[PDB]
């Protein structure tokens, strides 16, 4: 790999850059160290990495740009805590947040309840996030996909359990209820990493840091990708008024003035304690919360 | 089929959705209808569609969606006049309503003419639309592909007339004609379902009517659609001025100020006018007539 | 071919039109006529198209559009100066022309050179030129895809460096080095065309003059053509303030305004002297000059 990737890979903050062709070995890469060259036959793994490519659709925001952002950010957060995890959670974790978000069509949970979809039927609670996960057991029977073949019975069941746990976690609803949880059991000390349980609910929070990350790089790459995923909320607020419903604030096109508000409100209410919360459990992972507020400085230099 | 879908799908100011992998089971519900369970062996039919979808190019406004709404409308239309039209008509009418646009460019028969196209020197007159025609036979060609291989050939022939006329009578400049003609002769009592020539007629304005469909929405998908549209039509006035002519104002995206008062042009001249003698010769059309009408008194709220 | 194209293609300023599947035969046609219709089998010929086609990637400006515009300017101003080239040189350089900017990223050797992209690694100069080149031989080594195999070991070596050289001077950083030479050359009476050396040079700046002949169409082209370009330096405008790098006005998507003007200094300092130079070496290359300064004229008029 480059020279200049080599050494920024290992940042927070870093951007994948805009070639596809680079992100596949980009990942390999990322495995290949935190993880181990043993960890993976490659031959399966690039066919793999291949096909959950091929199932990320072309939208602004949820694409395969964004699954490898993701799983950047879980490969710096375990290069900076390597002593914390065995070897099936560092398999598992980077491999979830690559498929966390598969087939995503650019609708919330919210607009598949109304419109009725198929998908709200057969999942009542986190449709989109369980179809991801879906997608990836979809993915992993096929003939040479099997990445975790070499894996005993044993192993195999509790790595999908990661998998499946983590994906789950990236709904942003659940977040809340994970976060105030978890920021009562540190100030208690009741908070212990030998739990399972709370091992759970700290890979959650994880994986929400990762899921949101974009508000941890560089000024200019956070406001570019805002554009993005405003792309796709102005679209989900237009299906909504073809509805007939009026879509919240966030989603109206009509309201582009309101922006600034709605990031400032958005970095209070949500981002900051994140990644605060995820430096208390985990000091390594400072970089993201001070990079955090250097982009919320930057959204009241607006308004 | 959905819930939400089976309720509103009855509708005529229904929309069809932004999910692209619906569309295909929508079309077969409403031939499941309409038609019968009999009517095309399932098999050949998705086959038919797939590749029907396959030749619908990826422009803005005149595509895929564009197709399955067009011939929904046909379907509320056929559904509240149950008794007025044969098996055959039912059979080939939402089927030319689906090919009716096949392998549109974005650019109108003015522009055809004008660039000195090939299709321009095969098809002098109505030029898409004789394309549109010739697709759909090609596509009926094709191994497994003949949806009317049950049909008698007795049968075949009348309902690829059918559906050749149809197709034709889309053709915008031919509408004028066609309705002045209906209009005299439903004041006259001259007009008469069991006279072959005047059942064309009428379902030419039946064609026109759900080719411009999108008028007789809500007013949110109404107002959308328009720029889908116009991102057409301002590309083709690109394209003029390459030629060195002056396109009309319709056209030229340097005159986006014009819109609405061409908007109410259109609707006063044509819009209106369609579904005005359309629901005088059939009674239960008159909710496009409505929303046609309640979407004027928006264009007349811009200005 | 149309009776429309087959006159207005032997003018300079000719548009291609937006109708993609006639480039492929407006290419042959320009082949058929300048070179002749022994020069390739056709057969082979089509199948090398197509592949090449298949090559360039969907951006805004260096597509597959361009090449063929580029290739038609090529045209032109071989059937213009019919007597001064070889059978060799006609084959080789409206080949070269189609293949000049394949795999093109839409980004600059300056971009592939600070983010350390292995392109910039491989190729230390004229990074994109060498790949054009390189994908070029790529393209011609694939079965029944030698457009070259009637040709004799020894002519088939000038060929490709006849369009390694073409390609090589499409880096617009080595057209200043080449004319400034060619000036000196012509005033001193010194430039010989019979001299290889001297041919080679003419031959650079005939390919430079090409590369920009978008400078030398109809007023409504030149502008249109002109947002394709931005789209593409705004993007890597983007991706510079992502490396942190200020990226030059040019590519600063915030400085819309002085458009105008770096299009006006563009003009004086590249556009006019390359097509002032060429007219002075090839005397029927006047209507490319004249035109360039009809539409630097316009630039003013916006100022
Ligand atoms: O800048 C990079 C983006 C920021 C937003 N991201 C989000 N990820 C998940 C959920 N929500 C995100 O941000 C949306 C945008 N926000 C809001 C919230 C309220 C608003 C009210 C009015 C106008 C806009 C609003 N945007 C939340 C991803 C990275
Ligand atoms: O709102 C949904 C659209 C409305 C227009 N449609 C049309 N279908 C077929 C033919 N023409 C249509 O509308 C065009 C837009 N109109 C005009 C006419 C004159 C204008 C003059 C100046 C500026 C804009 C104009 N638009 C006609 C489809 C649904
Ligand atoms: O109008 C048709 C285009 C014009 C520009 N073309 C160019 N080809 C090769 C290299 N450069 C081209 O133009 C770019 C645009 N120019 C500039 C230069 C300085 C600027 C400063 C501020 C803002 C914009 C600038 N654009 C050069 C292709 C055809
Ligand atoms: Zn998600
Ligand atoms: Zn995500
Ligand atoms: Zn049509
Ligand atoms: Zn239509
Ligand atoms: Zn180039
Ligand atoms: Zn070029």
Known sequence: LPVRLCKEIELFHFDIGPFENMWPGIFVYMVHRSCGTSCFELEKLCRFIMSVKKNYRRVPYHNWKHAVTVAHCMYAILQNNHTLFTDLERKGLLIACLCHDLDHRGFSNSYLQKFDH?????????????????????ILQLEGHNIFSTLSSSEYEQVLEIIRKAIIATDLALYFGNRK????????????????SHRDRVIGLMMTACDLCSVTKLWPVTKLTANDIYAEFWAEGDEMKKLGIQPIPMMDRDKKDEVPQGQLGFYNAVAIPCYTTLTQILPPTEPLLKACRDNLSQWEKVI
């Not at 009542?124 to 979809?138: D, I, K, L, R």
């Not at 949880?181 to 030998?194: A, F, H, I, K, V």
């Open 181 to 196: 949880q978890l920021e009562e059991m540190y100030q208690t000390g009741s908070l212990n990493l030998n739990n399972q």
């Open 118 to 138: 198929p998908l709200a039927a057969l999942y009542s609670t986190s449709t989109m996030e369980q179809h991801h996960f879906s997608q990836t057991v979809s």
